Symmetry: C3
Subunit: 272 residues, 3 copies
């Protein structure tokens, strides 16, 4: 099973199932237009049991400079909302069947919370995480139809309701409350080709819908306006085989207002 | 070559593979005022000796727009502007020469006119059409340079003048009048490959330029509307997928480039070919 | 050979490999949001032995910035370019090339214009040395390729009720891109690429002290889909869509160019 195909399948299927363990460094620039430059170092380890089950942690690391006639704000490399996945390959591909993988991705509020950030207007700091617990079930198909590998994916992210000491952006008020960050549905599809024994290329489109954030001061449920979100991405990416070592570059053209203008990913999946 | 022919149908606008029925779900996202527009197209088409083609399209228009606080407007499954189309394929592809099709698109103002809709200060309602007739002549050429299939396409939209009971956005007033919607030009090109016996992919570009719109209130004079004209630009990525070689699944992303065009537009078309 | 893999390189690399004298004429449309810009680029070129290439480019610019101001066709910023290949590709190496472009301020400078403003400019109005490195390399069938450049702008001396006059320093600019290309058949190729221009801020000193212009800083992301189609033995047709990504690019840009190899 040549590395172009197997790198292509890993990337698409979300299921690092070439070896038995796997560690991966990723670096991701994103550009928001408030002008804003955001880099993101990801660190991600995964192990495999019975060719069929996968477990993994991911640790994100976040530098962030936002500019607001103009004044600058910063956040130096902090975590990160740490997330762990479990994944299960319920269907192995055949002529009649696709490859299929159900998964669940719990994510925890380890990063700096966006709530309580006062306004000395320009923020006194920038966040690194939305401040709540998420749980994201998800599905992904992949099937080779020589020489196009078609692939696709759905997921839904329930956030869990949490409470907070301070939720006033105003510089004089400790107004405590609690927050339901509303749910999201995430859809995406695309097609990939094994260009040669080592290289593979992919075109894909994904979209993300967030269903509006309710809030409750210590008061009644007053939902945050402007908080619901559509986020459209268009992606061109390879897949370049190096050694066990691999480089995976990707561009993400921001089709929506809420998605960043573009985003350059450079991932380095390494397999023991 | 099932995908060659599915590519051409799609590129040309000319069903080669007698009768054709086509159901077409489309989503489109505007955000400049946020808006989520769903369209459903029923289309039926006859084809005569791969030479003449008549067809009819019936759009159906769900719509939802959003204007500290902020109200929303909606618009339940109302049908849009129906249209009949005659296309004549005057060149056959050869070594020397392309695959040429010339066509007219007669488009009738069945949908809910935008004019009159009183702005309840946010609209009272959302339109489903432009309220005027229009005939749009067009050309489309398609030529292989194996395995690259080049294609092109150009059209002009002449809108006819029409009278309305009310052209005013005011709730408090009713001024009837006439309108000339500014005519529009539409150029676009692209390339397409057959990936296998069932599938094709496409990369394409397109532009729509529109002349400005004029009103005439009674009994005043013609007055053109500022910032009414537009240049809607689009980048397309697409595929053909022969499903039962009879059924064809046609997905297509469309990335808006210009503020005048929808942020994106996903499309699904299910040509059924008899 | 082949004629595509040739023309593939010559766009990616910016280097006339397979020719002595070369002349390229091209037309470019760009929409902003309202403005409409066309540019006619007349490029001449000589190349010595897949090793040195010299080239002259004259831009001629027609613009319509609808607030409604025009600027009838007029010469832009004429530029020339010494360019030198320093690695020819092997199984191991890439086709590397180093380049230096001087761009002289032959276009109408933007600094004079008084605020609908009187006229539209057709050039930044200062000189600029502009070095840069290219790579191309075939990993059958993928031709990977990439670019890097800095852009030093030179200082010069030179708003309506009043009329002040002094020195200006245009921001320096780093640029870089990457892309895969394909040889589709004997006559034609297809490309895909990305690039981001990063313009540093711009100081201005009245006849006074150096004041940064807030806003003059910029980031111009672009995404490009392209082709080379071989017409004659020596005429390529080079179409290229360039979808802008950030607010500082144009919404879009088509370019048709026609390099003839004489
Ligand atoms: C809260 C988590 C963020 C939402 C991500 C959901 C995406 C799940 O889609 C399944 C397919 O994913 C494709 C690539 O994912 C790789 C991540 O796992 C690394 C294993 O090597
Ligand atoms: C940015 O990276 C994209 C180009 O990749 C260059 C790496 O080339 C190595 C290919 O050979 C293995
Ligand atoms: C119309 C411009 C043509 C000028 C070409 C002369 C090139 C000499 O080197 C420039 C320094
Ligand atoms: C201890 C490997 C990565 C972060 C890159 C930062 C880029 C430069 N800058 C100025 C924006 O910080
Ligand atoms: C996108 C539109 C390309 C197809 C054009 N046409 C006239 C055949 O429908
Ligand atoms: C000349 C400018 C440097 C980059 C090279 N190229 C051909 C991509 O333009």
């Amino acid at each position: 099973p040549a590395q172009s195909v197997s790198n292509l399948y890993n990337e698409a299927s979300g299921f690092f199932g070439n070896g038995k363990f796997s560690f991966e460094t990723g670096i991701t620039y994103a550009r928001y237009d408030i002008k804003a430059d955001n880099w993101t170092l990801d660190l991600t380890g995964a192990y495999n049991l019975d060719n069929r089950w996968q477990f993994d942690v991911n640790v994100p690391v976040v530098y962030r400079e936002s500019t607001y006639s103009e004044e600058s704000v910063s956040r130096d490399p902090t975590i990160g909302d740490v997330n762990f996945g479990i994944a299960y390959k319920f269907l192995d591909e055949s002529a009649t069947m696709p490859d299929a993988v159900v998964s669940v991705r719990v994510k925890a509020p380890t990063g700096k919370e966006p709530f309580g950030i006062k306004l000395v207007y320009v923020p006194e700091s920038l966040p690194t995480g939305n401040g709540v617990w998420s749980i994201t079930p998800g599905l992904s198909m992949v099937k080779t139809f020589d020489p196009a590998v078609l692939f696709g994916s759905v997921s839904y992210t329930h956030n869990l309701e949490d409470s907070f000491d301070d939720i006033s952006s105003d510089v004089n008020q400790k107004v405590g409350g609690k927050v339901r960050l509303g749910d999201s549905f995430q859809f995406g599809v695309g097609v990939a080709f094994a260009l040669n024994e080592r290289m593979s290329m992919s075109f894909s489109v994904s979209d993300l819908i967030q269903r509006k954030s309710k809030l409750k001061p210590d008061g009644g449920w007053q939902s945050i306006v402007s908080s619901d979100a559509n986020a459209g991405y268009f992606n061109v990416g390879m897949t370049i085989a190096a050694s066990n070592l691999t480089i995976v570059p990707n561009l993400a053209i921001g089709m929506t207002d809420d998605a960043p203008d573009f985003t350059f990913s450079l991932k380095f999946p390494y397999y023991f």
